[PDB]
């Protein structure tokens, strides 16, 4: 079983994920170095679907340079039929690490916190709004974590959730750059008290419920950490206006008193 690209042949290992007439296979390439190499096939696909693809991939070129937080894009091959796109192969998800995990490391979930900030950063000083961030969208390479994806086009299943949607996504069916502090508030929840806010609503139509809800009061259970306790409360205000910034989280004393 082989992939070519570019010239280049790449063995099959194992399938990882796969989505809307996409897959993502880990490979081999001659020297025996390891990527993940995602196939999208294009025969059904909408002038919609198409552009969306068009633009995942123009983005992550473009955002290369700019953050080692974001996945590697080594090579890609479009036509009409499919594309291809030769990618660094993590050695886990964020979701299944986390899934795996006992406690966490204090310094290992700054250091990865910090690396989220960066990455999601990154995204919106060249106007990206993500929008439904979650464990699954960064990935563990080397020592750090990377995003691997924008939200531009559809998120690989591997081989949902409303845990991470934010209460403005909710109320607005009658972007902002907010919404992904939200989202971010919430992994970081997870790291720190083994459970999202609302992981306890095991019903969804409730669980959206209290997300929305200004009389619903999310519990923050006090740790060592004063710092990180704070960084929790103001990434999950419910109002976006008062929520902190991606700016401001920057500058917070969680990520720049060592
Ligand atoms: O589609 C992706 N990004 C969109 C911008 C183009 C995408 C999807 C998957 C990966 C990727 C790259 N590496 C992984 C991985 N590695 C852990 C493994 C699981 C099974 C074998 S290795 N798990 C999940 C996803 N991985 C990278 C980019
Ligand atoms: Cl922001």
Not at 39 to 60: G, H, P
Not at 71 to 99: F, H, P
Not at 108 to 115: L, T, V
């Amino acid at each position: 079983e082989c992939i070519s690209v570019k010239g280049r042949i790449y063995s099959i290992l194992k399938q990882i994920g796969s989505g809307g007439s996409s897959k993502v296979f880990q490979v081999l390439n001659e020297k025996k170095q390891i990527y993940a190499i995602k196939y999208v096939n294009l025969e059904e696909a909408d002038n919609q679907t198409l552009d969306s693809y068009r633009n995942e991939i123009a983005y992550l070129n473009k955002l290369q340079q700019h953050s080692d937080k974001i996945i590697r894009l080594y090579d890609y091959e479009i036509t009409d039929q499919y594309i291809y796109m030769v990618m660094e192969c993590g050695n886990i998800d964020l979701n299944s690490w986390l899934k795996k995990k006992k406690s966490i490391d204090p310094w290992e979930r700054k250091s990865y916190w910090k690396n989220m900030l960066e990455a999601v950063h990154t995204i919106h000083q060249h106007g990206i709004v993500h929008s439904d961030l979650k464990p699954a969208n960064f990935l563990i390479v080397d020592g750090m974590l990377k995003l691997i994806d924008f939200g531009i086009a559809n998120q690989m299943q591997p081989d949902g959730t409303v845990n991470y949607m934010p209460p403005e996504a909710i109320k607005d069916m009658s972007i902002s750059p907010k919404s992904d502090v939200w989202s971010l508030g919430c992994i970081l929840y997870y790291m720190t008290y083994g459970k999202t806010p609302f992981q306890q609503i095991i019903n969804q139509i409730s669980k959206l419920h209290a997300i929305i809800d200004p009389n619903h009061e999310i519990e923050f259970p006090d740790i060592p950490e004063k710092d990180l306790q704070d960084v929790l409360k103001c990434c999950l205000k419910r109002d976006p206006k008062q929520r902190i910034s991606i700016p401001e989280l920057l500058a917070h004393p969680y990520v720049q008193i060592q």
